[PDB]
Structure 1
Amino acid sequence: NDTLKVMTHNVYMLSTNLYPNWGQTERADLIGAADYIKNQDVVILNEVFDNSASDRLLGNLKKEYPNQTAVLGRSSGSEWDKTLGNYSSSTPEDGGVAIVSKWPIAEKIQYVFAKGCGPDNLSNKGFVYTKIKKNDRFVHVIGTHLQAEDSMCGKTSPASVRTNQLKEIQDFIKNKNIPNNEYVLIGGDMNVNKINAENNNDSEYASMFKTLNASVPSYTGHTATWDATTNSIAKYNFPDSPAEYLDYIIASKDHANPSYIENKVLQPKSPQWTVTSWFQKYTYNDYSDHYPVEATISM
């Protein structure tokens, strides 16, 4: 139909071995049945860390999105066409990134970043590359989740680490020799804040597009993707943190340049769910502490 619909959503599914009461299992069902995640061509998921809940979610999304990748950094067998980067089978946690699609996935590649804040690789953070055949056309979708802000980051800063991670993504894209007439999208929680930096050509926000050689999309919908002022989980965790705009889906300019590409932030609310933590009961109506970003790409 000459329109590509891609969504990315950091679903906040921390391991239940470390965070027992965040309703991971129930939200796997709520998200899986949610209306906001339907009718897409491809969906990028971030933070699908908990093994049981993530597999449950993927299972719930199987009907509409039967073509799925394994979760970044959880395994390294034939389920991946290639396992690149600093992959380690002994990390305490996986990368929490996965891509599902209603269309056949021709190639699945996982790549683990060389570095992050801290000298050790304890989560195989990185990206997932997919070559997808969407109605007689091959599109390329890379899903990722970049280094978060960390008080401790050695002699380097979170921004410098993210730039290096973005560099690995771009270097991989160039090396792949993808036809320049096919669409190449990079999406996920970049942990790069757009708020108050959209007009600053020197902001980390501006550098993101330069490093990935990507174009800037048209922005619609809500004004933030991690908002403690409207999101129930974010409010619980960080009541006074200003809203931030951290999730994106952008296109490589070294390939097919979309005549139009939009990133819309949605604010879907989930059915009410409750958890008990330290003898105190809490109720929420959000699927995650992050809001999903829905992209419309004209092809």
Structure 2
Amino acid sequence: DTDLKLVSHNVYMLSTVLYPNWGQYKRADLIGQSSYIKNNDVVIFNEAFDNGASDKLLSNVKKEYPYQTPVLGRSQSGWDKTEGSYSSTVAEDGGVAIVSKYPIKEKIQHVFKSGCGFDNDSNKGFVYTKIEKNGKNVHVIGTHTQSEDSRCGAGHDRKIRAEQMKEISDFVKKKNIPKDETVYIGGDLNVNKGTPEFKDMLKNLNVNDVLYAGHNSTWDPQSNSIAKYNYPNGKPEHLDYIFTDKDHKQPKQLVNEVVTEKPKPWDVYAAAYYYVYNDFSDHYPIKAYSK
């Protein structure tokens, strides 16, 4: 009715200056040609860091999703409001963008005030959109929260995520969005399913849990060729979600499906080594919808 089909995907579009050989441009095209990216209402991207590769990706999906936000933290242009700890002086944007098949009526970027000082060179945060479907409004917040960084510390990473999630939920409450409109909150939330922290996330984001489908992890060194390479030893975890605020209208029966679609194999002929991969990113995308 106003309920949406969404995808969220951390696309691993690292800086092509710092990480020249991660197939960023090749993957921007493959993602655009994929099936999972198609036939949704709204797509949330995370780790759209490299400006050129990210803009290519966004361009690759513009015909289907003509209404697009800028990428979080790139500049103040194109936003209805910029808030949080927005910095001109950070070399890296926040990598979050939202595209929509339906007109975006309002777009706000919020760079997180909470974070870690020895990788604070990112405008990480959330992007809020109000979207009009069938003359009615629906709200989508896309985000990407503090990674499990071995330098900041596990305990600190968890506290950072808590505060960042509270920034989102505070934003939602202060926005005074009428309770008869749904507010989706999704992205790479970096909290593993089935953990003590997971219960905290539901409270801090003010969301209900969802029904799950498909694969049982979203970052999976056992089946994903990119994750496998980077962290051969890694435990698969389920880190990407799309939830709705629990005090606003609920979808009929929200599902999060972890999609394991793979592109045709693609290579990087680095001077040092040759490598072949067959994933869009080191994370799998989530598709959310109600059946």
Bin the TM-score by the shorter chain. Answer: over 0.9
Change (3 A) 1:120 1:264: closer
Match of 1:271 in 2: 264
> How much is the aligned-residue C-alpha RMSD, in angstroms?
1.5
- Does the alignment pair 1:291 with 2:284? yes
Q: Verify the 8 A CA contact 2:2 2:133 in the aligned structure 1.
A: no
Q: Distance in 2 between matches of 1:115 and 1:216?
A: 25
The answer to which of 231-240 and 114-123 deviates more is 114-123
Question: Aligned match of 1:217 in 207, 210, 223?
Answer: 210
TM-score by length of 1: 0.94
Percent identity between matched residues is 60
| C-alpha deviation, 1:118, in angstroms | 1.7
Pairwise CA distance, 1:235: 0.6
Matching of residue 136 in structure 1 with residue 135 in structure 2: yes
Match of 1:200 in 2: none
Task: Give distance in 1, aligned partners of 2:153 and 2:2.
Answer: 47
Where does 1:50-129 land on structure 2 (aligned, <5 Å)? 50-77=50-77, 79-118=78-117, 121-129=120-128
- The TM-score normalised by the length of structure 2 is 0.97
| Whole-angstrom distance in 2 between the partners of 1:257 and 1:64 | 26
Q: Does the CA-based 8 Å contact 1:118-1:154 persist in structure 2? A: no
Count of aligned pairs between the two proteins: 291
Extract unaligned runs of 5+ from structure 1: 198-202
* Cα 1:35–1:87 shift into 2, 3 Å: same
* 2:197 paired residue among 204, 210, 213: 204
SS of 2:102's equivalent? coil
Give, in whole Å, the separation in 2 of the partners of 1:286 and 1:154.
29
Deviation at 1:257, TM superposition (A): 2.3
Quick one: which amino acid aligns to residue 217 of structure 1?
V
Equivalence for 2:163:
164
Structure 1 residue 156 displacement after superposition: 6.0
Unaligned runs of 5+ in 2: none
Residue 54 of structure 1 aligns with an amino acid whose one-letter code is: S
Residue 279 (structure 1) shift: 1.7
Structure 1 residues 155 and 190, CA, compared in 2 at 3 Å: closer, same or farther?
closer
Instruction: Tell me the equivalent position of 1:46.
Output: 46
Distance 2:65 2:9 in 1: 15
Q: Which runs of 4+ in 1 moved over 3 A?
A: none
2:149 corresponds to: 150
